[PDB]
């Protein structure tokens, strides 16, 4: 049975930040739970933001506002940067 997860992406991000460090299966379960929880929080806040403004679509502005609302302080400030240029790079390609 094909069970989807964020395992390989968390592993390759780990190899970016720590190329000689491994990880255990329980820590990967915790990382998968963290990514799913943060995805659910940001998507729910963006859904509420689209509902309050009478908009039928979720754009990058809603995700940016949800990140500013949920992420505390400087963690938002870099992440709002880290999303934006990625969107810009996507605009440079697609």
Partner DNA sequence: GCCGCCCTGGAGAATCCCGGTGCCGAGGCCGCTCAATTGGTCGTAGACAGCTCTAGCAACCGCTTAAACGCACGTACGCGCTGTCCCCCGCGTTTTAACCGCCAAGGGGATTACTTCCTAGTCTCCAGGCACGTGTCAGATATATACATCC
User: What minimum distance in Å lies between the beta carbon of 58 and DNA?
Assistant: 8
48-67 residues in contact with DNA (CB under 7 A) are 57, 59
| 3-state secondary structure string across the chain | CCCCCCHHHHHHHHHHHCCCCCCCHHHHHHHHHHHHHHHHHHHHHHHHHHHHCCCCCCCHHHHHHHHHHHCCCHHHHHHHHHHHHHHHHHHHHC
Nearer to DNA, 61 or 77 (CB): 61
Query: Does residue 8 bind DNA (CB under 7 A)?
Result: yes
Query: Does residue 7 bind DNA (CB under 7 A)?
Result: yes
Contacting positions for DNA (CB under 7 A): 2-5, 7-9, 57, 59
């Amino acid at each position: 049975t094909r069970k989807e997860s964020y395992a390989i992406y968390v592993y390759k991000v780990l190899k970016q930040v720590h190329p000689d460090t491994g990880i255990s299966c329980k820590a990967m379960s915790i990382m998968n739970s963290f990514v799913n929880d943060v995805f659910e929080r940001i998507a729910g806040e963006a859904s509420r933001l689209a509902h309050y403004n009478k908009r039928s679509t979720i754009t990058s502005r809603e995700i940016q506002t949800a990140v500013r609302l949920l992420l505390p302080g400087e963690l938002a400030k870099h992440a709002v940067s880290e999303g934006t240029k990625a969107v810009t790079k996507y605009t440079s390609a697609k």
